[PDB]
């Protein structure tokens, strides 16, 4: 078993109001079975497109999930990941400052 | 350029199994082979390389037999391991060639740990492999037919098909996309310290140079981040600098890339541009790290 | 070589059977089971390599359980037989083609019966050559007739002057049903010994037709008026005539 | 079924040529085997075929294989009476012990003897023990031609049938009354 690394980031400079694309990039996990959702305020975002799963030179898997979004001063985006190496589902919030 | 075909095989129990594949030329995905699909999908227009339809069809049928035979073969060999049938089981396969003269390879991992490889004419166990692998390896090695076509694949077919992909993929392997950079800030884990963050996004090809600067002097505390992908096969990177408060003044993030001529991107902290960029990012800060 | 046991067995419909495959040389370790139904269609069952490997499989119409106990012994428990099967045991090394070979055993013929009282031993009769045949062809043919037996497993041989002969013999390939429309019918089988007229006409010449029959064991419960039909030999004999 | 043999049954005169067909759809086809099973006995390997366009000679046997057409043939030159057997075409799933065999239904080969100058006759034979059971012997019919035995083949080779019955007035002359009988058959009075 290897626990997932979750990184959340925007495609373009994250100006409020303007349309942008949010990326949730999961890494360093084994086995390859994994559930990923992207969350807006708590509710699941209906169309989250995903890349195919691949692995790296250390034989650990990585996948990229992404969706279009419009950032707001008040609206919060997150990425939840269920994996066997974890008791509870890990939820990671987008921090534009990070 | 390093061509690699990757294979992910999951064996959950006696009945359940799937196997999916992806093919990379450098940092560009060229093929996708889902368990669900009978055929091998193209992700690019040039994914057929220089092969002709008849030559491609033959190879796809070659692989179609392989996928079905592999799944049966593994589920019989799994009966020889210690302890007997240790479900679940993951098998990973990495086969390709590097370009220069060339160098083909085929490596195999079991439960995430690399244990077997093809070498010369046969299958061999790598140093530190489980001793139970000796028996399965002998049976696989007894199969001249497999042995001979794998040889053909690695020695002859990988280099040839790649050399074709490279020629017909040149246009896409040469394209240049400009980085866009923007600045942000976070409190540091140490008291009175703050972490300056320089976001570089949307660049291709992958090689890039990013540093914090006091004009002349590169700031040695610059921590380059990991290369994170974008959905459109571009790249995202960030570089951080830990400063004491009232030391941000006079600092700049510099970015060198092949797509910028010689004209580096320089962003100064507190510069008129930065101020207006920052005013557009504001938010309530929850739930912050 | 590859010893298969037992060679033959009667199975009262609704009981199990134990089959063994002791292998004489450990250099050919890839033991596997093959089935051949009453319609002569062959099929692969199980293929076992490691000691301790046990596997189950259900087929029309017999359920199997095969284990590889030791590196030399291979078992197969056969249960719930509906209809007759014959089971073959094969071993090879890792290679099995260019550097061969693949080896086959003698097999185990299993026959399924409903009732035990349905087992009858054969009546045997030798019919003397025709005096017309002798005139016309200068050869003399004896016919042997084994009738009224069940099941169909009989082995027939000719014995001229106390020793077995193959020269001049042709026996039926398979037995035939006496009452063809009925399921629990009894069988009959014929053979011919064709000799020269001179050789038959010798009064000192003795002709015997023996028929081995495979039926019940000493380990089968039986209390009925007629005799307990054990695995036995039944014969008939004739001496020659001069005229 | 994945291995189709044809025909199901075949008849040849002793000394003539005989050809058996096998078309398969097993994938992958690594090798092909021919087997001979004498009735009531085990299997005997006749030949193994390995390559894309193969051929092998086993004394009186010879076989070809085309993997392109997933097809094989077996030839027996100058057939003997002991060639009466079932012939089984089988395909090798792998080139190692990981593979499984797939078996065709078998083609049943029946060899009928070359009887130049036949001598058809029906004789009645009596029980050695007395009495009064009897049997009929039909001897030496050429192989174009109540419990009747199927025709068997002797080795001077002869086709011969045997008929017996327990019915009031049998009798041998009209025993093979459901049969094609030579117009010159000898029917001696009993
Ligand atoms: C290969 C790279 C060259 C570049 C060209 C390809 C570019 C196009 C992109 C393709 C994308 C598709 C993703 C491909 C996945 C990457 C792996 C590719 C390498 C696969 C090996 C090719 C094997 C081909 C031979 C084969 O199908 N063998 C078959 C059939 O063989 C049978 O049929 C044949 C007829 O076709 C012959 O007659 C043979 O004698 C008979 O036995 C045979 O069954 C093989 O044994 C299959 C297994 C092979 C996997 C080896 C695994 C070793 C690891 C075991 C250790 C784990 C421990 C176990 C618990
Ligand atoms: C594929 O290339 C390998 C080398 O990478 C060849 O393996 C050699 O085989 C020869 C003769 O079989 C041996 O003398 C060498 O020792 C082998 N080399 C190694 C490094 O093991 C192989 O023969 C080639 N196959 C084909 C079809 O050309
Ligand atoms: C095999 O695995 C799948 C998924 O892990 C599961 O749905 C199925 O119940 C399993 N079958 C078994 C344990 O027989
Ligand atoms: C994957 O595909 C194979 C056919 O190649 C199928 O038999 C198997 O059940 C599939 N597994 C899943 C999980 O879809």
From Swiss-Prot, chain A:
GO terms for molecular function: protein homodimerization activity; structural molecule activity. The gene is B2m. Keywords: Disulfide bond, Immunity, Immunoglobulin domain, MHC I, Secreted, Signal. Its main location: secreted. Heterodimer of an alpha chain and a beta chain. Beta-2-microglobulin is the beta-chain of major histocompatibility complex class I molecules. Forms a heterotrimer with MR1 and a metabolite antigen. The chain holds residues 22 to 119 of 119 of the full protein. This is Beta-2-microglobulin. It comes from the Eukaryota. It comes from Mus musculus (Mouse). GO terms for cellular component: cytosol; external side of plasma membrane; extracellular space; Golgi apparatus; HFE-transferrin receptor complex; MHC class I peptide loading complex; MHC class I protein complex; phagocytic vesicle membrane. Belongs to the beta-2-microglobulin family. One of its GO terms (biological process) is negative regulation of neuron projection development. It is found in: Secreted. Residues 4-93 form the Ig-like C1-type domain. Component of the class I major histocompatibility complex (MHC). Involved in the presentation of peptide antigens to the immune system. Disulfide bonds join 24-79.
UniProtKB/Swiss-Prot annotation, chain B:
Residues 179-269 form the Ig-like domain. The keyword Electron transport does not apply. Residues 1-269 are extracellular. Keywords: Cell membrane, Disulfide bond, Endosome, Glycoprotein, Immunity, Immunoglobulin domain, Innate immunity, Lysosome, Membrane, Signal, Transmembrane, Transmembrane helix. It is found in: Cell membrane; Endosome membrane; Lysosome membrane. N-glycosylated. It is a single-pass type I membrane protein. Glycans are attached at residues 13, 35, 155. Its main location: membrane. Heterodimer with B2M (beta-2-microglobulin). Interacts with MHC II and CD74. During protein synthesis and maturation, CD1 family members bind endogenous lipids that are replaced by lipid or glycolipid antigens when the proteins are internalized and pass through endosomes, before trafficking back to the cell surface. This is Antigen-presenting glycoprotein CD1d1. It comes from Mus musculus. The chain holds residues 26 to 297 of 336 of the full protein.
């Amino acid at each position: 078993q290897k626990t997932p690394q979750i990184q959340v980031y925007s495609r373009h400079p994250p100006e409020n109001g303007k349309p942008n694309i949010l990326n949730c990039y999961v890494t360093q996990f084994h086995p390859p079975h994994i559930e990923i959702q992207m969350l807006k305020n708590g509710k699941k975002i209906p169309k989250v497109e995903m890349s195919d799963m691949s692995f790296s030179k250390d034989w650990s898997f990585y996948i990229l999930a992404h969706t279009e979004f419009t950032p707001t001063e008040t609206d919060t985006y997150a990425c939840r990941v269920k994996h066997a190496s974890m008791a509870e589902p890990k939820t990671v919030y987008w921090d534009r400052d990070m | 350029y390093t061509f690699r075909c990757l294979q992910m095989s999951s064996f959950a129990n006696r009945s359940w199994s799937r196997t999916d594949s992806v093919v990379w030329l450098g940092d560009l995905q060229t093929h996708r082979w889902s368990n669900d699909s009978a055929t091998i999908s193209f992700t690019k227009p040039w994914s057929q390389g220089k092969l002709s339809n008849q030559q491609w069809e033959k190879l796809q049928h070659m692989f179609q037999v392989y996928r079905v035979s592999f799944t049966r073969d593994i589920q019989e060999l799994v009966k020889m391991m210690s302890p007997k049938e240790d479900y679940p089981i993951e098998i990973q396969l990495s086969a390709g060639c590097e370009m220069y003269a060339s160098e083909s390879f085929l490596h195999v991992a079991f439960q995430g740990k690399y244990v077997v490889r093809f070498w010369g004419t046969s299958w061999q166990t790598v140093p530190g492999a489980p001793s139970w692998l000796d028996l399965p390896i002998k049976v696989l090695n007894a199969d001249q037919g497999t042995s001979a076509t794998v040889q053909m694949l690695l020695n002859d077919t990988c280099p040839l098909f790649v050399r074709g992909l490279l020629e017909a993929g040149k246009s896409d392997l040469e394209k240049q996309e400009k980085p866009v950079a923007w600045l942000s800030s976070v409190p540091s884990s140490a008291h009175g310290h703050r972490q300056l963050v320089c976001h570089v996004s949307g660049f291709y090809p992958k090689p890039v140079w990013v540093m914090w600067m006091r004009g002349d002097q590169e700031q040695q505390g610059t921590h380059r981040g990991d290369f994170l992908p974008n959905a459109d096969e571009t790249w995202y990177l960030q570089a951080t600098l830990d400063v004491e408060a009232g030391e941000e003044a006079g600092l700049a993030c510099r970015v060198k890339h092949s797509s910028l001529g010689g004209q580096d991107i320089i962003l100064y902290w507190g510069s008129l541009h930065h101020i207006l960029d920052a005013q557009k990012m504001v938010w309530n800060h929850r739930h912050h790290h | 070589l590859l010893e298969q046991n037992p060679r033959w067995r009667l199975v009262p419909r609704g009981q199990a059977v134990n089959l063994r495959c002791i292998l004489k040389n450990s250099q050919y370790p890839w033991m596997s089971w093959y089935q051949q139904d009453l319609q002569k269609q062959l099929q692969w069952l199980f293929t076992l390599r490691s000691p301790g490997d046990k596997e189950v499989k259900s087929l029309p119409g017999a359920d199997y359980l095969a284990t590889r106990v030791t590196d030399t012994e291979l078992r197969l428990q056969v249960a719930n037989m509906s209809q007759g099967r014959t089971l073959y045991c094969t071993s090879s090394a890792d290679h099995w083609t260019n550097t061969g070979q693949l080896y086959f055993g003698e097999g185990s013929k299993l026959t399924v019966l409903e009732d035990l009282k349905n087992v009858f031993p054969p009546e045997v009769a030798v019919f003397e050559p025709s005096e017309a045949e002798i005139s016309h062809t200068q050869k003399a043919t004896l016919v042997c007739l084994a009738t009224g037996f069940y099941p169909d497993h009989v082995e027939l041989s000719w014995w001229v002057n106390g020793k077995e002969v193959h020269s001049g013999v042709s026996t039926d390939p398979q037995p035939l049903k006496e009452q063809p429309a009925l399921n629990d019918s009894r069988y009959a089988l014929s053979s011919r010994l064709r000799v020269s007229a001179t050789f038959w006409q010798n009064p000192r010449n003795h002709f015997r037709c023996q028929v081995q029959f495979y039926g019940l064991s000493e380990n089968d419960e039986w209390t009925q008026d007629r005799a307990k039909p054990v695995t036995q030999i039944v014969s008939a004999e004739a001496w020659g005539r001069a005229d | 079924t994945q291995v189709e043999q044809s025909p199901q049954s075949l008849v040849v005169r002793q000394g003539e040529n005989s050809v058996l067909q096998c078309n398969y759809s097993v994938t992958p086809d690594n090798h092909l085997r021919w087997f001979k099973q004498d009735t009531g006995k085990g299997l005997v390997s006749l030949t193994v075929l390995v390559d894309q366009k193969d051929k092998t000679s086993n004394g009186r046997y010879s076989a070809t294989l085309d993997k392109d057409a997933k097809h094989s043939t077996l030839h027996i030159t100058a057939t003997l009476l002991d060639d009466t057997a079932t012939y089984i075409c089988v395909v090798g799933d792998r080139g190692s012990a990981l593979g499984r065999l797939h078996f065709g239904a078998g083609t049943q080969l029946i060899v009928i003897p070359d009887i130049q100058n036949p001598d058809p006759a029906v004789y009645q034979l009596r029980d050695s023990k007395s009495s009064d059971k009897s049997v009929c012997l039909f001897t030496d019919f050429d192989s174009q031609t109540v419990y009747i035995t199927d025709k068997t083949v002797l080795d001077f080779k002869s086709n011969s049938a045997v008929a017996w019955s327990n019915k009031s007035d049998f009798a041998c002359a009209n025993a093979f009354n459901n049969s094609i009988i030579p117009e010159d058959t000898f029917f001696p009075s009993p």
